[PDB]
Each structure stands twice: as C-alpha cells, then as structure tokens.
Amino acid sequence: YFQSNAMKHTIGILGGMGPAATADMLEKFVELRHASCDQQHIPLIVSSIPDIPDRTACLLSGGPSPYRYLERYLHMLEDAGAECIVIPCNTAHYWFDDLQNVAKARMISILDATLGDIPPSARHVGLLATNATLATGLYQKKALARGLTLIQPEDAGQALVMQAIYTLKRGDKTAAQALLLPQIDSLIARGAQAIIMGCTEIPLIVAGHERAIACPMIDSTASLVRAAIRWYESWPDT
C-alpha cells in the first residue's frame, strides 16, 4: 500500500483535536473537491486518535505535552503512505515547525491558509480561538506581516468563547451557540471587518447562523482543506 498510496498523493489528516472538528474536515474535503463520482475524490488517511493531551492545558497550565503524540501519529500517517499532512487544530500549530522538521511529508499550515482567505479589504479582523492560541500569538506574527490588526475578545468574553469551544467538545452544540453568538456580536460592535474562526470547533458552532452574522466568518478548517486540495491538484497526473 505504501508506495502506491504515495504515488497517488495521499493526504494525511492529523486530527482528533477534537474528533468533531476532524469529521467536519472530512465533510469539507467532500464538499470542496469537484468529483464526478466516488473515485474522483481526494485519497485521505485520518488519525482521529484523541488521547492527545489538551493543548491549552499544556501551554497555559503546565499539563503534559501533546508533542510526542503528534509526532507518533505523524509518522503513522507517513508510514501509511501520506505525502502531505494537515492538522485540523489551530492550537496544535504551536508545534507546527517542530513537526515539519521531523516530517518527510509536506505539511500545510492552518494559519497561513486561513489568513490567505481573508478579503484584502478586511484589515481589522476579529479572532475567535482558544486561550493558548491567543496567548502564544500563533496568528500574531503572520497577521502583522500581512498588514492586519487582530481584535480579540476581552477577558470576560474570552472566557465565554473558551466555554463555548469546550461545550462543543462535550457534545452540546445548542449550549455552545448561546455562549458564542453574543461574542461574535461584540467583535462586530468593536469594528471587526471579518472574524477568523481560529479554532476548528468554532465552524461547528456557527454552522446554520452565518446568515444572521453581519460580517464574513473565515473558516480555518475550510481554508486548510482548500489549501490541501490545491496541493493535490498540482501534480501532473492530477
């Protein structure tokens, strides 16, 4: 399988962070790839092994590091024949450069993909993300380089965004939506021209309410999927 999977430009999804976001990524690979039939869709191998330690607990509360888990499942995907690896978790990109160095497969960053899909006129941009993604500034250096100004929720509001994410991770979308939606309105009221959904649970909470939201919402999961499809479609046989 390995050599023919590699010849076929198989994409590996390093997911499980969390599992609903990984399932959402798979749906988006189906929705965003033009295919005449089953056989024209993207070849995908998915790691949805969610025992990976909590990313914010590690970065902000001294919890066990997820790195060695990420490294192990990365190598599992490569050994299965993945030639490109994508990670449907923003906070995990704290370790992106580390994983890239040990990877033989190509890796595509969710951060670059997401920032690249912001309309050029949107210069003041809200950011919905986990505490650790904000605190370690994962989007900060890259946003500054593109001439963007990020707006994040205040301390009280950011606690509610974190609650929404973990309520989604617990399986209660309706509760998560009631928590998140006033924070989206607050970001707009403070002048967000666009809002980055910079945690891959956020698209799952917003889904069905984009019409009720004044400004565009940038879907980091979809941005990464689109980038991976462009990689897949750039080969001479594709």
Known catalytic residues are 89, 199
Helix axes 173-189, 155-170, angle to 10 degrees: 150
Is 89 annotated among the ligand-binding residues?
A: yes
Compute the distance between CA of residue 229 and CA of residue 42 in angstroms, rounded to an integer: 8
Closer of 20 and 175 to a copy of itself (Cβ)? 20
**Kind and range of the H or E element at 132?**
helix 131-135
Does residue 90 bind F ion (CB under 5 A)? yes
Nearer to a copy of itself, 22 or 114 (CB): 22
Q: Are 229 and 8 in contact (CB under 8 A)?
A: no
Is residue 126 part of the contact set for a copy of itself (CB under 8 A)?
no
Q: Is 142 annotated as a binding residue?
A: no
Distance of CA 220 to the CA centre of its chain: 5
Peptide bond before 147: cis, by omega within 30 degrees of 0?
no
Q: Does 42 bind K ion (CB under 5 A)?
A: no
CB of 90 to F ion, least distance (A): 3
169 binds a copy of itself (CB under 8 A): yes
Q: Which of 70, 200, 218, 229 binds F ion (CB under 5 A)?
A: 200
- CA distances to 28, 90, 114, 171 from 164, in Å: 22, 16, 21, 11
Binding of a copy of itself at residue 90 (CB under 8 A)?
no
For K ion, the binding residues in 66-125 under the rule CB under 5 A are: 89
Q: CB under 8 Å to 201, separation ≥6 — which residues?
A: 18, 20, 21, 165, 168, 169, 176
User: Which residues, 6 or more positions from 207, have their beta carbon under 8 angstroms from its beta carbon?
Assistant: none
Angle at 98 between CA 129 and CA 136, to 5 degrees: 30
Which one of K ion, Cl ion, a copy of itself, none interacts with residue 231, CB within 5 to 8 A by kind? Answer: none
Among F ion, K ion, Cl ion, none, residue 128 binds (CB under 5-8 Å by kind):
none
The reply on whether position 193 binds K ion by CB under 5 A is no
Work out whether 57 is an interface residue with Cl ion (CB under 5 A).
no
Select from 40, 63, 68, 238 the one that contacts Cl ion (CB under 5 A).
68
- The backbone region for 81, taken as left when phi is positive above 0, alpha when psi lies in -120 to 50, beta otherwise, is left
- Kindly list the residues in this chain that would bind F ion in the complex (CB under 5 A): 89-90, 199-200
Q: Interface residues with K ion (CB under 5 A)?
A: 21, 89, 171, 200
- List residues binding a copy of itself (CB under 8 A): 1-2, 4-5, 8, 10, 13, 16-20, 22-23, 26-27, 29-31, 35-54, 72-73, 75-76, 79-81, 166, 169-171
